[PDB]
Amino acid sequence: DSISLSLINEGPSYASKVSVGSNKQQQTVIIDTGSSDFWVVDSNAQCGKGVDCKSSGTFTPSSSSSYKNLGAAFTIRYGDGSTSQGTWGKDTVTINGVSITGQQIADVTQTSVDQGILGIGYTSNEAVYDTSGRQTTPNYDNVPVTLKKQGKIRTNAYSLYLNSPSAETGTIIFGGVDNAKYSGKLVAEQVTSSQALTISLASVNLKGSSFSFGDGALLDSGTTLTYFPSDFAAQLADKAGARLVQVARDQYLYFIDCNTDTSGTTVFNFGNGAKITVPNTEYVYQNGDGTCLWGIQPSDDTILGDNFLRHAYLLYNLDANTISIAQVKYTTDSSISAV
Ligand SMILES: CC(C)c1nc(CN(C)C(=O)N[C@H](C(=O)N[C@@H](Cc2ccccc2)C[C@H](O)[C@H](Cc2ccccc2)NC(=O)OCc2cncs2)C(C)C)cs1
Numbered sequence: 344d345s346i347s348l349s350l351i352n353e354g355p356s357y358a359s360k361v362s363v364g365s366n367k368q369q370q371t372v373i374i375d376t377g378s379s380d381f382w383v384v385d386s387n388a389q390c391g392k393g394v395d396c397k398s399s400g401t402f403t404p405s406s407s408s409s410y411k412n413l414g415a416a417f418t419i420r421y422g423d424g425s426t427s428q429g430t431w432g433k434d435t436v437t438i439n440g441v442s443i444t445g446q447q448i449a450d451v452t453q454t455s456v457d458q459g460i461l462g463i464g465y466t467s468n469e470a471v472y473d474t475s476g477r478q479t480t481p482n483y484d485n486v487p488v489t490l491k492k493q494g495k496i497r498t499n500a501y502s503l504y505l506n507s508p509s510a511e512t513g514t515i516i517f518g519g520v521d522n523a524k525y526s527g528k529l530v531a532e533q534v535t536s537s538q539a540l541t542i543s544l545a546s547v548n549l550k551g552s553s554f555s556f557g558d559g560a561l562l563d564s565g566t567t568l569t570y571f572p573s574d575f576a577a578q579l580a581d582k583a584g585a586r587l588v589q590v591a592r593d594q595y596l597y598f599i600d601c602n603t604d605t606s607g608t609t610v611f612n613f614g615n616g617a618k619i620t621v622p623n624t625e626y627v628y629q630n631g632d633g634t635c636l637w638g639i640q641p642s643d644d645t646i647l648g649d650n651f652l653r654h655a656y657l658l659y660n661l662d663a664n665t666i667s668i669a670q671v672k673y674t675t676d677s678s679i680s681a682v
Pocket residue numbers: 355356373375376377378379419420421422423424425456457460468469470563564565566567568644646
């Protein structure tokens with residue numbers, strides 16, 4: 344079947360509403376193709392210093408009579424330093440009506456993160472470790488795998504339309520595909536990792552010049568921007584005129600002249616003759632003040648994040664080990680297919 348869930352464009356992340364427990368407590372959580380674990384803010388948690396982690400709704404295990412506690416510790420750290428510590432449990436999850444009993448989540452009692460995050464990647468990528476690497480629970484069925492297993496979806500798959508940068512809602516469908524919001528054909532691409540949802544990027548065309556790359560990249564719904572290895576990211580910054588700019592001890596960030604030309608487009612060539620074009624406005628991000636960040640940053644891991652993914656329709660399929668892509672089309676229209 345199809346389960347279209349709405350995606351709220353918060354700015355840096357896209358969240359959906361999820362209700363959890365017997366009394367269906369509504370949390371808004373980030374939808375995350377970069378993580379595989381679903382955790383929510385607990386009512387009685389201390390948010391990290393200077394962070395308002397409870398204004399996207401909270402979770403009270405005591406109010407839900409289906410809530411079972413595993414008694415295993417939970418801990419995760421995100422690429423930007425945010426972490427989240429809490430406890431492993433089980434309970435009812437409802438997503439736009441449909442409901443899965445005994446879905447294992449993490450109840451989090453402290454978090455430098457702004458809201459809960461619904462991670463929906465490969466179960467092999469679950470945070471089941473503590474900071475020493477010593478294991479705290481077996482790899483478990485996450486949401487998507489529990490949907491399929493309770494016969495909610497046919498296959499463990501989903502599509503991802505985040506809409507235009509001006510758009511307020513976009514959409515994710517579980518075990519369904521809109522065939523009206525992409526041109527061309529959907530080009531299936533082999534995932535290059537049994538742990539992360541990565542596909543071979545061959546090269547990137549930037550400001551009319553081609554830059555061979557050849558290595559995998561994560562199609563992450565929950566990264567805001569786009570990251571590359573320093574060396575590569577450096578060659579790219581040059582040609583576009585971005586400056587690397589130390590703002591912390593070991594953290595650097597590319598800034599760019601706020602009035603740089605962005606009439607161009609930036610192209611991403613994948614393996615099967617797939618191609619996704621990104622308009623350059625996606626590479627000036629505004630800082631509240633009078634500075635602008637480059638939408639491309641350096642990092643150990645390549646990530647095509649929100650600023651890339653706006654511009655593609657994507658048919659993730661975790662039982663196939665494929666992610667199909669097609670240049671994005673923006674419309675009110677739609678037409679779904681319960682694959
Ligand atoms: C202003 C504020 C709200 C925000 N700024 C940002 C801009 N930044 C830096 C991010 O996008 N942050 C990304 C990130 O960590 N994203 C997170 C979402 C998040 C949301 C709110 C606050 C903090 C994090 C979620 C992302 O899918 C990343 C992708 C990733 C995976 C492995 C290695 C590196 C990166 N997921 C994870 O890092 O999960 C960690 C694990 C994977 N497997 C076991 S643990 C980084 C990859 C850059 C996000 S939210």
